[PDB]
Amino acid sequence: ARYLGPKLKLSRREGTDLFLKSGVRAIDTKCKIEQAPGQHGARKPRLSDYGVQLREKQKVRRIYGVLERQFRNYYKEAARLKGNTGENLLALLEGRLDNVVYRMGFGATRAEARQLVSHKAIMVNGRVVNIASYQVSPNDVVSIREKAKKQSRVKAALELAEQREKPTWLEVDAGKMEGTFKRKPERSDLSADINEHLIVELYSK
Amino acid sequence: KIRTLQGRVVSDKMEKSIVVAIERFVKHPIYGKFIKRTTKLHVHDENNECGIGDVVEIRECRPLSKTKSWTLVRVVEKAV
Amino acid sequence: ATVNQLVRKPRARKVAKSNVPALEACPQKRGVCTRVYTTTPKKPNSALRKVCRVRLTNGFEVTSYIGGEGHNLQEHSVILIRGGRVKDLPGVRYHTVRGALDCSGVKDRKQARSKYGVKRPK
Amino acid sequence: ELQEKLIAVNRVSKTVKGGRIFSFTALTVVGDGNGRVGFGYGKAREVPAAIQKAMEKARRNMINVALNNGTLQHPVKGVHTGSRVFMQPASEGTGIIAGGAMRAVLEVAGVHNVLAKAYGSTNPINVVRATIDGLENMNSPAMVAAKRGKSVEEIL
Amino acid sequence: MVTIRLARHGAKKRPFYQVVVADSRNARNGRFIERVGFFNPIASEKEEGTRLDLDRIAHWVGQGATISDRVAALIKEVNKAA
Amino acid sequence: SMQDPIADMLTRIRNGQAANKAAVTMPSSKLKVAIANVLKEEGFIEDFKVEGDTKPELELTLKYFQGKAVVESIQRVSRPGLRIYKRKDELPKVMAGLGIAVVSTSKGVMTDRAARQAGLGGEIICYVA
RNA sequence: UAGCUAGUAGGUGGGGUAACGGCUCACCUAGGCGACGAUCCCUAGCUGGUCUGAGAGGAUGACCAGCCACACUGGAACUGA
RNA sequence: CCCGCAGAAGAAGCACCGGCUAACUCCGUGCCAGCAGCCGCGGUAAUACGGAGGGUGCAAGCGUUAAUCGGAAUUACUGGGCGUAAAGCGCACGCAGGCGGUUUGUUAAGUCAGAUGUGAAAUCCCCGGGCUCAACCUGGGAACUGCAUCUGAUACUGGCAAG
Ligand SMILES: [Mg+2]
Ligand SMILES: [Mg+2]
Ligand SMILES: [Mg+2]
Ligand SMILES: [Mg+2]
Ligand SMILES: [Mg+2]
Ligand SMILES: [Mg+2]
Ligand SMILES: [Mg+2]
Ligand SMILES: [Mg+2]
Ligand SMILES: [Mg+2]
Ligand SMILES: [Mg+2]
Ligand SMILES: [Mg+2]
Ligand SMILES: [Mg+2]
Ligand SMILES: [Mg+2]
Ligand SMILES: [Mg+2]
Ligand SMILES: [Mg+2]
Ligand SMILES: [Mg+2]
Ligand SMILES: [Mg+2]
Ligand SMILES: [Mg+2]
Ligand SMILES: [Mg+2]
Ligand SMILES: [Mg+2]
Ligand SMILES: [Mg+2]
Ligand SMILES: [Mg+2]
Ligand SMILES: [Mg+2]
Ligand SMILES: [Mg+2]
Ligand SMILES: [Mg+2]
Ligand SMILES: [Mg+2]
Ligand SMILES: [Mg+2]
Ligand SMILES: [Mg+2]
Ligand SMILES: [Mg+2]
Ligand SMILES: [Mg+2]
Ligand SMILES: [Mg+2]
Ligand SMILES: [Mg+2]
């Protein structure tokens, strides 16, 4: 139910940095980020329309760590919801609890955040939530519980997050180790490299 | 006001009884054309008042025979 | 075409026959090998293709391909047949299932094992 | 700003005393994203040359299209010999729901929200020709007002 | 005769009873004349959980409808709460 | 036999526009006159003129704007072989509301928009674009 | 599969049913159904729904709920609201 | 459901990589062995067979088979056609049937409008609520395009009467 393989392998295949490493060390130093994985990496075949759409979808899925059935469900939900479908999909993905934890900074990677969430380190509105796919809502406080409050990983992660670019849609208290999910982000608020439109076309073939 | 149907008398041979076509001008389910559909009814008529070709108004009633559950109420356009 | 014509005589749906009628809308069916032989392919191919004429549980006498390299089949050998034609044996509409009742899994296969009934090697 | 994209590249042959002579044909389509779209069909012995010829042709002989807010003006049909095409305006956010060639032509033209289908033949060149014809013919409400001798407000 | 009784609905271990008027012969979840309320025994706090249309119940009783013991209890609870 | 006079009239209009004819003449009828009147009101033709007593002739004066025909398309819808009637919620919008649809209602022959405003359906005679 | 039907179609009168009724019986009349498909043959429980489809349709009727029929096969009644 | 204990500990496979269709190399065989949904591949340099390495796609599942709708405007009511691609009876007459120039009156059958009754609950959809989330359960709506009756309108079509 989770991808347990090499992460820079995934990043190399996509082309971009998927943030599968903490970002202490540069990805160029950890791998040949430019060259694609495998014997035939040093080759860029001309990509079909289907291929480009698939690659974009794969990129997004890898970024968040969602397998296909769940991703498809997300897309359907987005389509059902009013407004722009790609935008809705992005919002839902962002809404995921592991993602919010990562954004707040209670984990260097989403993999780390997911681990914490699974292992019951994270309380949503003072109630231990265990599901990584848990949709966080606006005005939801999300906090590290004290047993995980002593974790050196958590404090290190916070430091790394401080280095990273802070999200506008959250407000996080580093000493309290609690963050309030004020609102679901807008498309202008999320990253521009993601071409949600390709994904919409692919799941609307 | 009572429920009643009009129709042309298709036959009047069986005694005290007439057969009354009740053509309805329905629309076709699929093609949308309007088709003339027909409804034969055995109607009871006492006194054998009705002729063939006669327009006749009928109402529904308790069954009077195997096939006969309608009675006539008034004849109209009873020309020959 | 004329609306009147359609009303008179409506449009007939094109009743498509099945191409695997011995299955009788079953996903597989059991049968007994009446006869096991090799046959020549069609004009763009040369081979000796392994095939068995099989009497099915429901009466039908069909012909069935035997895929994979080598097989432990002979007369009176109970097998499961599945849908699929050999495009190049004329009139063969069914495959044997490798890895079923009397049919053995293919020997020494490491790929497509699920398709050839071979258990995972250590 | 003159967005262009090649729909289909196809190899065609001629026969001569010697043997066969192959050559390539490229169907391209350019457009400014504000209404103007034009297709071009180039032929050359090699693909890049063919594409260049096609591009030049497309860049010239463009045609203006009445677009209403990045969408069609009304549902329009279009034919070109085998290719009969249907295309319908759709709500903002629908995206281009359109075949191959059709999708390309619409996108370069600048329609952002359409529902299309290609009936009949789906031969790229003919289908593109059909779509361009349909788009061209499609009139706007200002046009209808002008024709009928009314205000646009009387027609709506 | 006509009776007013609970019909079990919901999921396993999470019952939700629909209060229905029905001919006693009919099966528990089967044919019923009128649905006159609901009752949710696992309903949490800050949730209604019970709702009986009392006027309809009164009307049916007047007509001569018997009442299940549980439904009677529910009616009593509603009256006290209100 | 002549089996559809309205259709004939529509065809005449179409052919006149195709052939750049200034006017088109045909045997007059009350329904035809009503349709023509609707057309004039909406501005798809310049004028109509009924002339004669025993067997009167309708003469429509067709309309051109930039060398080309104003009535781009004009199709019969209801026809003797297949009558079409619509309810107020089902009334069609021709060319997404730019063209008009001539509808015969209980309150006389009117365009689709007018009929919708009134709140009644009827026999859909033709679309005009 | 083009003709089918003699309680067959209708009437009068008795009987019968909780009830109308050829439900049944006696007589009288000679009708009745059928190309808008009678009769005959093959297949099938029906519906809310389900799947699919832009829709119109197409396919389908497990589960859940409404109706129907059956209870080894073929008949029959008794008791009883 | 909660608390505690120990220790990464007990927990990843299946299909595919010639085009359609995301993913390529080497070796083995040599029209054989075999593959295949279609088109096709293999006759001694096989990205198509078989193994390996590498990769792609799904993932506690993954393939294959069967079955239905879709694509299929390939039964075309919406929405096709018939000179030569399949398709105009060899030609006529004519009953049933389908269609009917033009005016007025009348009727109100088709048609249209409004109301009333019904269209079980579940289901579908919308806004909520409850299971840590989801599935699932659930409150209220919307919908159920239908059918029936009554009251109207009378342009068109039908009936009737005169032209
Ligand atoms: Mg799962
Ligand atoms: Mg056949
Ligand atoms: Mg060959
Ligand atoms: Mg009697
Ligand atoms: Mg008596
Ligand atoms: Mg049966
Ligand atoms: Mg049955
Ligand atoms: Mg369709
Ligand atoms: Mg069963
Ligand atoms: Mg029984
Ligand atoms: Mg029994
Ligand atoms: Mg038994
Ligand atoms: Mg018995
Ligand atoms: Mg008793
Ligand atoms: Mg008794
Ligand atoms: Mg590829
Ligand atoms: Mg293979
Ligand atoms: Mg060799
Ligand atoms: Mg080799
Ligand atoms: Mg291959
Ligand atoms: Mg291989
Ligand atoms: Mg179809
Ligand atoms: Mg055709
Ligand atoms: Mg021919
Ligand atoms: Mg001839
Ligand atoms: Mg007339
Ligand atoms: Mg007539
Ligand atoms: Mg009426
Ligand atoms: Mg319901
Ligand atoms: Mg909730
Ligand atoms: Mg009239
Ligand atoms: Mg009249």
Short mmCIF file of C-alpha atoms in Angstrom, two decimals, chain B:
data_model
loop_
_atom_site.label_atom_id
_atom_site.label_comp_id
_atom_site.label_asym_id
_atom_site.label_seq_id
_atom_site.Cartn_x
_atom_site.Cartn_y
_atom_site.Cartn_z
CA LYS B 1 -69.89 14.63 -14.20
CA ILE B 2 -69.02 10.95 -14.63
CA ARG B 3 -66.19 9.24 -16.49
CA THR B 4 -67.27 8.29 -19.98
CA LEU B 5 -65.87 7.40 -23.39
CA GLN B 6 -67.14 7.91 -26.92
CA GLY B 7 -66.85 5.50 -29.80
CA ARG B 8 -68.24 4.23 -33.06
CA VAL B 9 -70.39 1.07 -32.95
CA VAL B 10 -68.37 -1.62 -34.74
CA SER B 11 -71.16 -4.19 -34.37
CA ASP B 12 -74.62 -4.63 -32.89
CA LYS B 13 -75.58 -8.24 -33.64
CA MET B 14 -75.39 -9.92 -30.23
CA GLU B 15 -78.64 -9.11 -28.48
CA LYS B 16 -78.66 -6.28 -25.92
CA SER B 17 -74.98 -5.79 -26.76
CA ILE B 18 -72.79 -3.71 -29.08
CA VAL B 19 -69.06 -3.55 -29.84
CA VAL B 20 -67.66 -0.01 -29.63
CA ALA B 21 -64.25 0.91 -31.08
CA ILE B 22 -62.65 3.68 -29.00
CA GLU B 23 -59.86 4.88 -31.32
CA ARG B 24 -57.29 7.01 -29.45
CA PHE B 25 -54.71 9.13 -31.26
CA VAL B 26 -51.57 8.30 -29.29
CA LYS B 27 -47.96 9.27 -30.01
CA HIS B 28 -45.40 6.58 -30.78
CA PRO B 29 -42.98 5.89 -27.91
CA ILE B 30 -39.80 6.05 -30.01
CA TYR B 31 -40.41 7.57 -33.41
CA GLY B 32 -42.74 10.34 -32.23
CA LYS B 33 -45.32 9.84 -34.96
CA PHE B 34 -48.94 9.97 -33.85
CA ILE B 35 -50.60 6.60 -34.48
CA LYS B 36 -54.31 5.81 -34.45
CA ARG B 37 -54.78 3.00 -31.91
CA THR B 38 -58.11 1.21 -31.40
CA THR B 39 -59.92 -0.17 -28.34
CA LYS B 40 -62.77 -2.59 -28.97
CA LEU B 41 -65.21 -2.82 -26.04
CA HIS B 42 -68.27 -5.00 -25.58
CA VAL B 43 -70.87 -2.56 -24.26
CA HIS B 44 -74.21 -3.46 -22.77
CA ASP B 45 -77.18 -1.75 -24.35
CA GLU B 46 -80.67 -2.58 -23.18
CA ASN B 47 -83.55 -2.13 -25.64
CA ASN B 48 -81.11 -2.72 -28.55
CA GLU B 49 -81.28 1.00 -29.23
CA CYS B 50 -77.95 1.32 -31.04
CA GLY B 51 -77.25 0.84 -34.72
CA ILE B 52 -74.03 0.06 -36.53
CA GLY B 53 -71.86 3.05 -37.37
CA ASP B 54 -73.46 4.98 -34.51
CA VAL B 55 -71.44 7.22 -32.22
CA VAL B 56 -72.15 6.33 -28.60
CA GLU B 57 -71.14 7.46 -25.13
CA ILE B 58 -70.43 4.72 -22.57
CA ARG B 59 -69.48 4.38 -18.90
CA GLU B 60 -67.83 1.59 -16.92
CA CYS B 61 -69.85 -0.60 -14.59
CA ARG B 62 -69.95 -3.89 -12.72
CA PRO B 63 -69.29 -6.79 -15.11
CA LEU B 64 -72.46 -7.97 -16.81
CA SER B 65 -70.95 -10.92 -18.67
CA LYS B 66 -67.66 -12.63 -19.46
CA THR B 67 -66.64 -9.75 -21.75
CA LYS B 68 -69.16 -7.00 -21.00
CA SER B 69 -68.34 -4.40 -18.32
CA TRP B 70 -69.50 -1.18 -20.01
CA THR B 71 -72.96 0.34 -20.41
CA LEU B 72 -74.15 2.99 -22.82
CA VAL B 73 -75.20 6.38 -21.48
CA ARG B 74 -76.32 8.27 -24.58
CA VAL B 75 -76.27 7.91 -28.34
CA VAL B 76 -75.10 10.75 -30.59
CA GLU B 77 -74.80 11.07 -34.36
CA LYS B 78 -77.12 8.12 -34.94
CA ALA B 79 -77.59 8.68 -38.68
CA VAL B 80 -77.79 6.05 -41.40
#
